[PDB]
Structure formats: structure tokens, C-alpha cells
Amino acid sequence: KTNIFEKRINLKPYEYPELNEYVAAIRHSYWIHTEFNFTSDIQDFKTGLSEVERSAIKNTMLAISQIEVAVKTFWGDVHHRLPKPEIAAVGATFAESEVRHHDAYSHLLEILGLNEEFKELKKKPVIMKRVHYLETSLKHAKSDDDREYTESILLFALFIEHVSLFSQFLIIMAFNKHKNMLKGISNAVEATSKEEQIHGDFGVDIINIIKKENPEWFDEEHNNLIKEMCLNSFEAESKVVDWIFEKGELDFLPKAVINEFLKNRFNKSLEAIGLEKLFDIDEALLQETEWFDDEI
Amino acid sequence: TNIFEKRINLKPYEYPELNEYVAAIRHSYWIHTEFNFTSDIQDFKTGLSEVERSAIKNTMLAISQIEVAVKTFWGDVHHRLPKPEIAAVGATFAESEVRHHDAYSHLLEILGLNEEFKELKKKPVIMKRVHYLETSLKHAKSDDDREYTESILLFALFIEHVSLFSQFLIIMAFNKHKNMLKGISNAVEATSKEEQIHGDFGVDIINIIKKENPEWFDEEHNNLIKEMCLNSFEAESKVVDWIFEKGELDFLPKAVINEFLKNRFNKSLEAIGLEKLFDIDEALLQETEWFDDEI
């Protein structure tokens, strides 16, 4: 008789006690940027990096920080659609973790002398288009039918948190891997990724609950709509990657390699919710980022 | 600068002073697992009378359930004050309410009082308060900006600085007067520090709204707030009667709790620039001077 969409006022008993484990998971992964040491990173950025490298780092941290503001809102609003106190508890715990994250990356931009980047956001059409896309998506996640709600969860929890943000974490961590630079920032990125992993995992679980409770909504037509949405998301993400590298590609982490890493994570997101892979993976391009998953 | 106007870009903050509240909660952050409730379980089972057990049970049920609504309020503030720095505080506060409701539901569980949540619908006094906050969450979402200071006043002050503080007082009175519930008293102290911060933020944002929109706050509006405060006090006194449905605590009578409430209602009105409403009985108020001395 359990219906994830039906409001329950009383805190206990939980109808989904297994989902409560996500609150403990984030309490375990909890971190603030002040736990890390960025002193050497500042000098690495200001003296060690090339103009092309500085620009890629600056654009990546601006993209992470600003998008996390929207991801926070998504999680803080989930209870409006899935009005269960235990789900609301996860949502609030996740929203606060996004604030710790956006504070970390805005702090890094500040200490690197890159504060002006947020003021000029309106003048960066590629990243601002992504910002508006998420603002529009937050409106849809609030007002669209329950039948379509799995698409809002898929967008934020998977396509943004498990896919888009992971490619950005990959970009930053590649500096430590290939150049032995930005070690402190790489530690903060690793701490961020562990929390984003948890977020997407919860997104997978709630999509699977919705599918289990409402099997009639998830027909062949629905699966095709998700595949088209995934292809649209990839095309949009590839354009975000092109903007990150507007001043030039990193020879140690080319765009083709980042794009293959994205396609593979999109495939894993589809598979997690019971759908078939969409992208035919180039194993040589994918092997180039195997170190990332081994590091996490 | 307009607190009600959406700003998309994270930085620069328009209200950088409000950001300090994020650091404040990160400093006060706690989980119930940091405390030891072994001695408390024993006090509840053998040290407390049936009248005392009932007051503790009702108080923790009231705190835990109301914290679920307070969490939602903070998580929704961004919808009305769409500034990323305010949204950051709101999310940080909403998560602190989850740590709090987890602490009190855990305490109810370990004391063998789990069935209390199942029977909420059958407790009209506390359930009326529950529905009042659900209704207030709808109004905090949809009413005019002109009235938004009343939603903040209700949740951040009348609930977090007043109602919940009387409930913290009830529990902490057992440690003060009977040297019992020491572990629970430590958790209540940790909760109170975070609720203090929440109300302080509520005062700051109400004061910003008043400063930016002075024309809304005329003599008629100030009288509406005073009437709302009187109504809130009358409603709170009924919640106190229900907490003590099995009988009053001789060491903390209802008259003393009610005077503590009136004094905190006065402090909340004064914080937002209004005059005191209640003419305080100093003998009744003196009885709870220890509480502020403890925290």
C-alpha cells in the first residue's frame, strides 16, 4: 500500500528505513575545506601552471561551484514531491553537503585570486546556458507530473552528480596524477566525489522505488524518452567541456578522453536504473582514465 | 539591494554578514552518538515517577515532531529570499534540524516509547500544533512578501527561541533539580545552542526586511504582530498543559514555565524593534534564572 508520493506527517515509523542509511553515510563522509592544506596549490597555480592550464582549472572550479548551488536546491526540494520525513531527512542532509562543496570551490577561486569569475558568469554563454538549464529544471522538478519525476531525479542525481561533476573532478585530479601539482585541491576533490557518489546512489534507489511502485509508467516509449534525454545531456556536456578548454586542450587529458569517460558514466547511470547502455565505448580512450576510479 | 530579488551568481554575496551563520552551525555541529545515555535510561526506569516519565515522553515527542516542520521551513526560505548566501544558511539550518529530530526520536526509542509517533493523530493538543505548522509552511510559501516577516517570526522566534526553549527547560530541569537525565541534558544543551543561532538569524533577516521595506511596518502592522504573539502564547500554554496532562512537576510548575515563555516572547519582539508585550512577574521568572546560567 506504500506510496512514495503520499504525504506522511508522523516522523516514525519510517516507511523506507533503508533510505535512512544515506543520512549516516553523509555524516561519515562530512568534511569542510579547512581540513585541507592548499598553500602549495596556490603557488602551483600562480607559478607552476601554464596560461592554458590556469584557464582550465579556473573554468572547472567556477562550473563546479555554481552548479552545486542548483544541486543543493534540488535536494532541499525533493520532500515537496516525495513527502516522507525519512526522505526529507536525506534531502536536507544532501543539500547541506552541497553547501560545504560550493564553499570549498568558491574559497579555492578566492585564494587563487579568481573572485571576478562569478561577476562575469552572465558573459560566459556556454556555462550560463547550463546554469539556466538547471534553474528551468528545478521549476519542472517542482511542478511536473509524478509520472515524469524520475526524469528530474535522473537529471540532477545522475547526469549532473554522477556524470557532469565527475568529469570536472577528473579534470582537477588529473593535475595531481600527471604533474604532481594541486595536491591539496585533489584531496578536497576526492572528498567531494565520495559525497557525490552517495548522492547519485540515493537517486538510483529512489528512481528504482518509483519504478517498482508504478511499473505501468515505465514502458518502451518511456525508456526511449530517457535515451533521447541522455543523448541530449551528452551533447550539452561535450559543449561544457569545450568551454572549460576554451584556451586550449590539456595534452595529458585530451577532450576525446574526457568525452569517453562521460559516455561511460552515462551508460553506468542508465544501467543502474535497469536500462541498456547507449554508447559504444572506445576502450583505448576509456583506459586512459582508469586511474581515476582506482584513486577514488 | 532587495532581499526578495533572485540573484543567480553565487558570489559576490549581497549579505556577507549572513554567511557567518554557516560557520556558526559548523562549529556547533553534533550527533547524538557523541553522548552517553546509559545512566539516563536507568533514571527513566527507576528514578522518575509516572508523572515525570509522562512529562519527559510528551516533551521529546513534541520536540522531535516539531523539528521535522522547522527543518522544512529552513529548507524553503530560499524560495522567498532567493539569495545563494541565504540559501546556504537555510540548508545548513535544515540539516541541523535533522540531527536534532534524530537525537530525540533515538531517545524515545531507547526509552521504549516508539508507539508515541503512531498515536499522534489521537493526541489533539500536540497534533493541533503539528497541523498549525503544516498550515504555516503553506502560508510561508504562498503569502505576500509584505507578510513574510510573520512566517519568519513564527518559526525562527516563536517556535525556535520560545516554544522549543520551554521544552529544553523542562528536560534540563531534571538535571538541575534531581541530578538525573545527565546525558539527555548534554544533548539538550547542544540542541539549544543551535536553536539560539537559528533564531538569531531569523532576527537578522526580519530586521533586513524591515530596513529595506519601512512602509510595510506601520502601527497597524506592529499591533497585528502583538496580537499574533498573544495568540502564540495562549496556544503554547495549551501545549504546556498537554505535556503535563498526568500532572505538574513540583520542582518546575506550569506558572513558572509560562513566565519563562512570556519573557522569551518579549525578548523576540524587542529583538525586531518592538516593545515588550508581557508585564513580567519577577518571582516566577527568577525560578528559571539557572537555565540561562547553564547555557
Author numbering:
A (entry chain A): 103 to 398
B (entry chain B): 104 to 398
Quoted passage from the original study:
The apo form of LbNrdB∆99 also crystallized in P212121 with one dimer in the asymmetric unit, but with different cell dimensions. In the apo form in NrdB subunits, the metal-coordinating residues adjust to occupy the space vacated by the metal ions and engage in a network of H-bonds to each other. Two of these H-bonds are unusually short, i.e. between Glu170 and the water molecule (2.4 Å) and between Glu263 and His301 (2.5 Å). A more dramatic change between apo- and Mn2+-forms is seen in Lys174, which is in the apo form projected away from the metal site and into a water-filled channel between the two monomers of the dimer. This suggests that formation of the dimanganic site is accompanied by a refolding of the loop containing residues 171–174 (see below). In contrast, in the apo state, helix B is an uninterrupted α-helix, albeit that residues 177–179 near the C terminus are distorted towards 310 conformation in both the apo- and Mn2+-states. In the apo form, Glu237 on helix D makes a salt bridge to Lys109 in the other monomer. However triggered, the conformational changes clearly open up a channel from the surface of the protein that leads to the Mn site, which has previously been proposed to be important for the diffusion of superoxide. This channel is absent in the apo form of L. blandensis NrdB. The metal site is completely occluded in the apo state, thus metallation would require some proportion of the population to exist in a more open form that would allow Mn2+ to diffuse in and occupy one or more of the sites, driving the equilibrium towards the more open form.
